[PDB]
Coordinates of C-alpha atoms and ligand atoms in Angstrom, one line a residue:
Chain A
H20 CA -13.9 2.0 13.7
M21 CA -13.2 4.6 11.0
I22 CA -10.7 7.5 11.8
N23 CA -7.5 7.3 13.8
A24 CA -9.1 9.0 16.9
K25 CA -11.6 6.1 17.2
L26 CA -8.7 3.6 16.9
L27 CA -6.7 5.4 19.6
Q28 CA -9.7 5.2 21.9
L29 CA -10.2 1.5 21.1
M30 CA -6.5 0.8 21.8
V31 CA -6.8 2.5 25.2
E32 CA -10.1 0.8 26.2
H33 CA -8.8 -2.7 25.3
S34 CA -5.4 -2.3 27.0
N35 CA -4.7 -5.0 29.6
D36 CA -2.7 -2.6 31.8
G37 CA -4.4 0.2 33.6
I38 CA -4.0 3.5 32.0
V39 CA -4.7 6.9 33.6
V40 CA -4.1 10.6 33.0
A41 CA -3.6 12.9 35.9
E42 CA -3.3 16.7 36.2
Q43 CA -1.2 18.6 38.6
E44 CA -3.2 20.5 41.2
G45 CA -1.4 21.7 44.3
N46 CA 0.0 18.8 46.3
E47 CA -2.0 16.2 44.4
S48 CA -2.1 14.6 40.9
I49 CA -5.8 14.6 40.1
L50 CA -7.2 11.7 38.0
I51 CA -9.0 13.0 34.9
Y52 CA -9.3 9.7 33.0
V53 CA -9.1 6.0 33.8
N54 CA -9.5 3.1 31.4
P55 CA -11.5 -0.1 32.0
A56 CA -8.4 -2.1 33.0
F57 CA -7.8 0.4 35.9
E58 CA -11.4 -0.1 37.2
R59 CA -11.0 -3.9 37.0
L60 CA -7.6 -3.8 38.6
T61 CA -8.7 -1.6 41.6
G62 CA -12.2 -2.8 42.1
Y63 CA -13.6 0.8 41.9
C64 CA -15.8 2.3 39.2
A65 CA -14.6 5.5 37.4
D66 CA -17.2 7.7 39.0
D67 CA -16.0 6.7 42.4
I68 CA -12.4 7.7 41.9
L69 CA -12.2 10.4 39.2
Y70 CA -10.9 13.7 40.4
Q71 CA -9.0 12.2 43.4
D72 CA -5.3 11.6 43.9
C73 CA -4.4 8.0 43.1
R74 CA -2.6 7.6 46.4
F75 CA -5.8 6.4 48.0
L76 CA -4.9 2.9 46.5
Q77 CA -2.2 2.8 49.3
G78 CA -4.7 3.0 52.1
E79 CA -2.6 3.8 55.2
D80 CA 0.5 2.1 53.7
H81 CA 2.2 5.3 52.8
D82 CA 5.8 4.8 53.9
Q83 CA 7.1 2.7 51.0
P84 CA 10.5 3.1 49.4
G85 CA 9.0 3.4 45.9
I86 CA 6.8 6.3 47.1
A87 CA 9.8 8.5 47.8
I88 CA 11.3 7.6 44.4
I89 CA 8.0 8.6 42.6
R90 CA 7.8 11.8 44.6
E91 CA 11.3 12.8 43.5
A92 CA 10.7 12.0 39.9
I93 CA 7.5 13.9 39.7
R94 CA 9.2 16.8 41.4
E95 CA 11.9 16.7 38.7
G96 CA 9.5 16.0 35.8
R97 CA 11.3 12.7 35.0
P98 CA 9.6 9.4 34.2
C99 CA 9.8 6.6 36.8
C100 CA 8.8 3.0 37.3
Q101 CA 8.3 1.5 40.8
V102 CA 6.4 -1.5 42.3
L103 CA 4.1 -0.5 45.1
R104 CA 1.7 -2.3 47.6
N105 CA -1.8 -1.3 46.8
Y106 CA -5.2 -2.5 48.0
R107 CA -8.4 -3.2 46.0
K108 CA -11.8 -2.1 47.0
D109 CA -12.4 -5.5 48.7
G110 CA -9.2 -4.8 50.7
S111 CA -7.0 -7.4 49.1
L112 CA -3.3 -6.5 48.6
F113 CA -1.8 -6.4 45.2
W114 CA 1.6 -5.4 43.8
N115 CA 1.3 -2.6 41.3
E116 CA 4.2 -1.9 38.8
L117 CA 3.5 1.8 38.2
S118 CA 5.0 3.7 35.3
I119 CA 4.6 7.5 35.3
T120 CA 5.5 9.9 32.4
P121 CA 5.3 13.7 32.8
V122 CA 4.2 15.4 29.6
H123 CA 4.4 19.2 29.3
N124 CA 1.7 20.9 27.1
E125 CA 3.5 23.8 25.4
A126 CA 0.1 25.3 24.3
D127 CA -1.6 25.7 27.7
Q128 CA 1.6 25.7 29.8
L129 CA 0.2 22.8 31.9
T130 CA 1.8 19.5 32.9
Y131 CA 0.0 16.2 32.6
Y132 CA 1.0 12.7 33.7
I133 CA 0.4 9.4 31.9
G134 CA 0.2 6.5 34.4
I135 CA 0.5 2.8 33.4
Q136 CA -0.5 0.2 36.1
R137 CA 0.4 -3.5 35.8
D138 CA -0.7 -6.1 38.4
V139 CA 2.5 -8.1 39.1
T140 CA 1.1 -10.0 42.1
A141 CA 1.5 -13.4 40.3
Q142 CA 5.1 -12.7 39.4
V143 CA 5.9 -11.5 42.9
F144 CA 4.3 -14.6 44.4
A145 CA 6.1 -16.9 42.0
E146 CA 9.5 -15.4 42.8
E147 CA 8.8 -15.7 46.5
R148 CA 7.8 -19.3 45.9
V149 CA 11.1 -20.0 44.1
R150 CA 13.0 -18.5 47.1
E151 CA 11.0 -20.6 49.6
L152 CA 11.6 -23.8 47.6
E153 CA 15.3 -23.0 47.2
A154 CA 15.5 -22.6 51.0
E155 CA 13.8 -26.0 51.4
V156 CA 16.3 -27.6 49.1
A157 CA 19.1 -26.1 51.1
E158 CA 17.7 -27.6 54.3
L159 CA 17.4 -31.0 52.6
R160 CA 21.0 -30.7 51.6
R161 CA 22.0 -29.9 55.2
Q162 CA 19.9 -32.9 56.4
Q163 CA 21.5 -35.3 53.9
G164 CA 24.9 -34.1 55.1
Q165 CA 24.0 -34.4 58.8
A166 CA 23.2 -38.0 57.9
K167 CA 26.6 -38.2 56.1
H168 CA 28.4 -36.7 59.2
Chain B
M21 CA -9.8 19.6 21.3
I22 CA -6.9 18.1 23.3
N23 CA -8.1 14.6 24.1
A24 CA -6.9 13.0 20.9
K25 CA -3.3 14.1 21.7
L26 CA -3.7 12.5 25.1
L27 CA -5.1 9.3 23.6
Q28 CA -2.0 9.2 21.4
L29 CA 0.4 9.8 24.3
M30 CA -1.4 7.1 26.3
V31 CA -0.8 4.5 23.5
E32 CA 2.8 5.7 22.8
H33 CA 3.9 5.4 26.5
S34 CA 2.2 2.1 27.0
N35 CA 4.7 -0.7 28.0
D36 CA 2.9 -3.5 26.2
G37 CA 3.0 -3.7 22.4
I38 CA -0.3 -2.3 20.9
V39 CA -1.2 -2.7 17.3
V40 CA -4.2 -2.3 14.9
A41 CA -4.7 -4.7 12.0
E42 CA -7.2 -4.8 9.2
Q43 CA -8.8 -7.8 7.5
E44 CA -7.5 -8.2 4.0
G45 CA -8.6 -11.5 2.3
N46 CA -7.7 -14.4 4.5
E47 CA -5.2 -12.5 6.6
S48 CA -4.9 -9.6 9.0
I49 CA -2.4 -6.8 8.1
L50 CA -0.8 -4.3 10.4
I51 CA -1.9 -0.7 9.9
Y52 CA -0.5 0.7 13.1
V53 CA 2.2 -0.3 15.7
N54 CA 3.2 1.6 18.9
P55 CA 6.8 2.2 19.9
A56 CA 6.8 -0.6 22.5
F57 CA 6.0 -3.1 19.7
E58 CA 9.0 -1.9 17.7
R59 CA 11.2 -2.3 20.8
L60 CA 9.7 -5.6 21.7
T61 CA 10.1 -7.3 18.3
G62 CA 13.3 -5.4 17.1
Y63 CA 11.6 -4.2 13.9
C64 CA 11.1 -0.7 12.7
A65 CA 7.4 0.1 12.0
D66 CA 8.0 0.8 8.2
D67 CA 9.6 -2.6 7.7
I68 CA 6.5 -4.6 8.9
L69 CA 3.5 -2.4 8.3
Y70 CA 0.9 -4.0 6.0
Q71 CA 2.1 -7.4 6.8
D72 CA 0.4 -10.1 8.9
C73 CA 1.9 -10.5 12.4
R74 CA 2.6 -14.3 11.8
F75 CA 6.1 -13.4 10.7
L76 CA 7.0 -13.2 14.4
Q77 CA 6.6 -17.1 14.5
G78 CA 9.6 -17.6 12.2
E79 CA 9.5 -21.3 11.2
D80 CA 8.0 -22.2 14.6
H81 CA 4.5 -23.1 13.2
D82 CA 3.7 -26.2 15.2
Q83 CA 2.1 -24.3 18.1
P84 CA -1.5 -25.1 19.1
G85 CA -2.3 -21.5 19.9
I86 CA -1.9 -20.5 16.3
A87 CA -4.9 -22.6 15.2
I88 CA -6.9 -21.3 18.1
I89 CA -6.1 -17.7 17.1
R90 CA -6.9 -18.5 13.5
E91 CA -10.3 -19.9 14.4
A92 CA -11.1 -17.0 16.7
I93 CA -10.3 -14.5 13.9
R94 CA -12.4 -16.7 11.6
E95 CA -15.4 -16.4 14.0
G96 CA -15.0 -12.7 14.9
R97 CA -14.4 -13.3 18.6
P98 CA -11.6 -12.1 20.9
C99 CA -8.9 -14.6 22.0
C100 CA -5.8 -14.7 24.1
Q101 CA -2.9 -17.1 23.6
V102 CA 0.8 -17.3 24.5
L103 CA 3.1 -18.0 21.5
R104 CA 6.8 -18.5 21.0
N105 CA 7.9 -15.5 18.9
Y106 CA 11.3 -14.3 17.6
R107 CA 12.8 -10.9 17.4
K108 CA 14.6 -9.5 14.4
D109 CA 17.9 -10.7 15.8
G110 CA 16.4 -14.2 16.2
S111 CA 16.1 -14.4 19.9
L112 CA 13.1 -16.3 21.4
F113 CA 10.5 -14.6 23.6
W114 CA 7.1 -15.8 24.9
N115 CA 4.4 -13.4 23.6
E116 CA 1.1 -13.2 25.4
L117 CA -1.3 -12.0 22.7
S118 CA -4.7 -10.4 23.2
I119 CA -6.7 -9.9 20.0
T120 CA -10.1 -8.2 19.8
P121 CA -11.9 -8.1 16.4
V122 CA -14.0 -4.9 15.9
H123 CA -16.4 -4.7 13.0
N124 CA -17.2 -1.3 11.5
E125 CA -20.7 -1.9 10.0
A126 CA -20.6 1.4 8.2
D127 CA -17.4 0.9 6.1
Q128 CA -17.9 -2.9 6.1
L129 CA -14.3 -3.4 7.3
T130 CA -13.1 -5.5 10.2
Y131 CA -10.2 -4.1 12.4
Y132 CA -8.4 -5.9 15.2
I133 CA -6.8 -4.5 18.4
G134 CA -3.8 -6.5 19.4
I135 CA -2.0 -6.3 22.8
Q136 CA 1.5 -8.0 23.1
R137 CA 3.3 -8.7 26.3
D138 CA 6.7 -10.3 26.7
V139 CA 6.0 -12.9 29.4
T140 CA 9.3 -14.7 29.1
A141 CA 10.3 -13.8 32.7
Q142 CA 7.0 -15.1 34.1
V143 CA 7.0 -18.3 32.1
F144 CA 10.5 -19.1 33.3
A145 CA 9.5 -18.4 36.9
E146 CA 6.4 -20.7 36.8
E147 CA 8.6 -23.4 35.2
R148 CA 11.2 -22.9 37.9
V149 CA 8.5 -23.4 40.6
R150 CA 7.4 -26.7 38.9
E151 CA 11.0 -27.9 38.6
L152 CA 11.7 -27.1 42.3
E153 CA 8.5 -28.7 43.5
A154 CA 9.5 -31.9 41.7
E155 CA 13.1 -31.7 43.1
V156 CA 11.9 -31.2 46.7
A157 CA 9.4 -34.1 46.3
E158 CA 12.2 -36.4 44.9
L159 CA 14.7 -35.4 47.6
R160 CA 12.1 -36.1 50.3
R161 CA 11.2 -39.4 48.8
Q162 CA 14.9 -40.4 48.8
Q163 CA 15.1 -39.7 52.5
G164 CA 12.0 -41.9 53.0
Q165 CA 13.1 -44.8 50.7
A166 CA 13.7 -48.2 52.2
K167 CA 17.3 -49.4 52.7
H168 CA 16.9 -53.1 51.9
Ligands
FMN1 C1 -0.4 9.4 36.6 C2 -0.2 8.8 38.0 C3 -0.7 7.6 38.3 C4 -0.5 7.1 39.6 N1 -1.0 5.8 39.9 C5 -0.9 5.3 41.2 C6 -1.3 4.0 41.6 O1 -1.9 3.3 40.7 N2 -1.2 3.5 42.8 C7 -0.5 4.3 43.8 O2 -0.4 3.9 44.9 N3 -0.1 5.6 43.5 C8 -0.2 6.1 42.2 N4 0.3 7.3 41.9 C9 1.0 8.1 42.9 C10 0.3 9.1 43.8 O3 -0.7 9.8 43.0 C11 1.3 10.0 44.5 O4 2.1 10.6 43.5 C12 2.3 9.3 45.3 O5 1.7 8.6 46.4 C13 3.5 10.2 45.9 O6 3.0 11.4 46.3 P1 2.5 11.7 47.8 O7 3.6 11.5 48.8 O8 2.0 13.1 47.9 O9 1.4 10.7 48.1 C14 0.1 7.8 40.6 C15 0.6 9.1 40.2 C16 0.4 9.6 38.9 C17 1.0 11.0 38.6
FMN2 C1 -4.1 -7.6 15.9 C2 -3.3 -8.9 15.7 C3 -2.1 -9.0 16.3 C4 -1.3 -10.2 16.2 N1 -0.1 -10.2 16.8 C5 0.7 -11.4 16.7 C6 1.9 -11.5 17.3 O1 2.4 -10.5 17.9 N2 2.7 -12.6 17.2 C7 2.2 -13.7 16.5 O2 2.9 -14.7 16.4 N3 1.0 -13.7 15.9 C8 0.2 -12.5 16.0 N4 -1.1 -12.4 15.4 C9 -1.6 -13.7 14.7 C10 -1.2 -13.9 13.3 O3 -1.4 -12.6 12.6 C11 -2.2 -14.9 12.7 O4 -3.5 -14.5 12.9 C12 -2.0 -16.3 13.3 O5 -0.7 -16.8 13.0 C13 -3.0 -17.3 12.8 O6 -3.2 -17.2 11.4 P1 -2.4 -18.0 10.3 O7 -2.7 -19.5 10.5 O8 -2.7 -17.6 8.9 O9 -0.9 -17.8 10.5 C14 -1.8 -11.3 15.5 C15 -3.1 -11.2 14.9 C16 -3.8 -10.0 15.0 C17 -5.2 -9.9 14.3

């Protein structure tokens, strides 16, 4: 593409992480843009989820420690980064490393939020698998020693 | 309008490295890097703009993914490969690279979008799983092994 605006759009559309912009409206942060990676990550098309609060990705799983941290940071206008349990349209659980950055528009006096979403399910599963295997090694060490004593 | 500023903020607060390159002869030279790419590689943008990204390989050129990337760029198709890369201070990291060629038929120039992710932590975890699976299998075999 030609100008730098077209290149900025290409960069956002080809990002592997989800990228969204929300706008403060009362008690919700309303989605006003989602990129293709977010549609693929969540299983929803943009027309289905634009102009909603993204909390719907939690389903009924609302009492998560990272949720209170996000709330406090948004309240204070500070960036944050937390891993949450979210659910795709098909219902499957995935682990979402969410990065939120508040940005204040000095022209219109309005606050926007940049959100970056990364599916870290595979890394979460791998680390759980390491811990399970380490526990199995510990049991094999106990068993070699119960055979030595 | 205000959407161009938002596009810019989206790219600048991305956690992955994001770059644009342009075809120039037989190589692809950087014309834009975002802040995460500078933090990821350890280089300031001004020191590496208008260079080909292959400098991140150092002298570590015997990697199969390099030829795969080269051929994909040669054919104008996207690709994705994990390479060993080196920061300015020399430290190794595993770089998962997503490259998308985009041809501008009006100005007859080819651009490339590149996404860079440090996957060092995930590579080490998957290796750790394979090593532990082998350890568990050998320890169980030793418990089963004949005593003759
Ligand atoms: C830009 C942005 C992106 C967000 N993305 C997600 C998301 O992908 N998944 C999720 O569960 N919550 C996401 N949230 C959080 C919810 O929108 C909401 O802030 C959170 O659940 C805490 O507020 P609440 O207690 O009113 O629900 C995002 C918030 C913002 C501002
Ligand atoms: C947009 C773009 C981004 C790239 N980013 C990297 C990178 O971060 N690390 C790397 O080792 N190679 C990267 N490359 C690949 C090298 O630039 C080069 O294409 C590759 O080494 C194969 O070409 P060569 O055989 O001439 O070295 C990138 C290529 C493009 C087009």
